[PDB]
Amino acid sequence: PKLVTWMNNQRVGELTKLANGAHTFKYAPEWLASRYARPLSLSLPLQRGNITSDAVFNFFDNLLPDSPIVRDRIVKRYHAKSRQPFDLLSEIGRDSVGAVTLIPIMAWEKLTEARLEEVLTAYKADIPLGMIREENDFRISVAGAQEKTALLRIGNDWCIPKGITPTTHIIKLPIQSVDNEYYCLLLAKELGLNVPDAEIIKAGNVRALAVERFDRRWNARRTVLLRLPQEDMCQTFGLPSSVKYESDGGPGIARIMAFLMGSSEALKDRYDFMKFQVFQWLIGATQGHAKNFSVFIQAGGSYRLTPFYDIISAFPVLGGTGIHISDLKLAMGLNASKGKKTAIDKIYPRHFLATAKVLRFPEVQMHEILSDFARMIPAALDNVKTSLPTDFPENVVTAVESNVLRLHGRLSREY
Ligand SMILES: Nc1ncnc2c1ncn2[C@@H]1O[C@H](COP(=O)(O)OP(=O)(O)O)[C@@H](O)[C@H]1O
Numbered sequence: 001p002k003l004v005t006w007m008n009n010q011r012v013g014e015l016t017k018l019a020n021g022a023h024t025f026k027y028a029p030e031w032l033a034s035r036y037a038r039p040l041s042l043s044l045p046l047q048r049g050n051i052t053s054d055a056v057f058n059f060f061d062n063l064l065p066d067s068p069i070v071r072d073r074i075v076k077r078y079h080a081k082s083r084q085p086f087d088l089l090s091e092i093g094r095d096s097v098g099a100v101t102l103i104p105i106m107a108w109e110k111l112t113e114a115r116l117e118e119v120l121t122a123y124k125a126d127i128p129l130g131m132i133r134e135e136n137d138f139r140i141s142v143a144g145a146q147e148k149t150a151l152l153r154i155g156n157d158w159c160i161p162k163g164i165t166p167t168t169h170i171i172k173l174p175i176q177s178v179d180n181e182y183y184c185l186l187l188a189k190e191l192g193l194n195v196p197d198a199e200i201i202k203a204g205n206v207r208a209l210a211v212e213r214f215d216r217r218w219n220a221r222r223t224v225l226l227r228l229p230q231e232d233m234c235q236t237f238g239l240p241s242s243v244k245y246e247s248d249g250g251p252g253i254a255r256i257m258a259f260l261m262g263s264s265e266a267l268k269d270r271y272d273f274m275k276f277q278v279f280q281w282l283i284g285a286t287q288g289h290a291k292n293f294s295v296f297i298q299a300g301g302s303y304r305l306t307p308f309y310d311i312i313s314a315f316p317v318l319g320g321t322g323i324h325i326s327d328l329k330l331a332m333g334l335n336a337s338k339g340k341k342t343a344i345d346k347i348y349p350r351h352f353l354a355t356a357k358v359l360r361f362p363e364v365q366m367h368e369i370l371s372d373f374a375r376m377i378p379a380a381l382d383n384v385k386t387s388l389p390t391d392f393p394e395n396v397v398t399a400v401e402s403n404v405l406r407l408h409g410r411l412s413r414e415y
């Protein structure tokens with residue numbers, strides 16, 4: 001009937017499902033009066049009274065797994081009153097991306113290599129977000145379409161968080177996606193890009209990716225784990241996940257760049273975002289849509305770009321299923337002499353430079369980005385390969401660097 005919204009230990013407001021089925025949200029007067037109050041989302045600014053725009057249904061919907069099938073698994077796992085966000089969130093809304101806790105502070109259970117394996121293989125039996133039946137106080141929610149789960153790592157042990165206690169890592173299971181991402185992250189970091197740290201975890205015959213969450217922070221002394229307010233671009237624009245791709249009406253480079261002008265770290269964020277476009281291009285990332293970029297909602301409502309994530313290269317999947325390099329399109333196109341430029345195989349430095357111009361992004365900075373990749377790519381690819389476990393799949397490594405070096409050549413001939 002009514003879900004109270006908290007952020008760590010403070011009450012923010014309440015989400016209610018009215019008689020006509022619409023989702024409404026009201027901020028708590030106390031929260032509004034609080035010291036450094038901030039909105040749940042930039043599409044739901046602080047105000048008194050019921051908010052009833054579609055920006056509310058969409059905001060929370062965006063906290064839920066994208067797949068309609070996973071939602072199916074959830075509705076049956078907890079007998080949800082319906083498939084609507086409110087009802088699914090009533091069941092799994094205690095722990096979600098950012099700092100939003102919905103319920104109608106430190107407790108957990110350590111996992112044995114036997115139970116851990118279970119969790120990590122629960123989906124096999126239509127279990128949503130690895131929330132095995134054995135437990136009933138493990139309610140989490142993560143977006144994205146890739147099969148995953150979330151856990152708490154206290155020390156060197158993996159644990160199932162209880163009540164409203166938070167998780168610290170997103171875990172991705174095998175739907176060769178695990179090795180791929182791991183590789184792109186290490187490559188992203190080697191080039192000085194802001195990305196989370198990940199580590200491959202092995203429980204029996206299972207290989208999963210444990211990514212450190214940047215929406216969670218321990219206090220200095222490591223005694224209290226806090227959640228950090230954060231939202232993806234769809235939420236920030238009040239849009240439904242269904243339109244996350246620019247081709248479906250979602251935001252492109254221009255809109256995000258304009259948006260970033262309001263960042264408390266505008267110049268740097270605008271710089272890092274363009275630098276990331278060049279990166280996605282180099283490694284053949286085709287899924288850089290709107291839910292794959294987020295911002296921190298800081299004290300007072302100010303915002304800032306979070307570290308990049310969900311990095312996967314399409315290169316390793318080429319050939320095997322008929323997918324040709326000619327079919328790889330960036331999710332967000334660049335400026336072209338006429339219209340846009342989306343084919344990765346046809347994109348060159350001139351496209352980034354032209355895009356930068358129409359977006360009032362210093363041209364001296366675009367060149368810097370281009371030249372820095374030019375000289376750094378070879379060594380970066382080298383250094384990474386040597387940090388790979390001997391048991392890492394070689395085809396993945398070959399396809400990635402063979403295809404990168406190919407694209408990279410377009411930069412070295414110029415700079
Ligand atoms: N390191 C991280 N810290 C905090 N939130 C993250 C992190 N990685 C991903 N997320 C959040 O979780 C969602 C799902 O993860 P993602 O890697 O994008 O999934 P898939 O690969 O399922 O699309 C993202 O849309 C984002 O909101």
Ligand SMILES: [Mg+2]
Pocket residue numbers: 143144145291292310
């Ligand atoms: Mg995503």
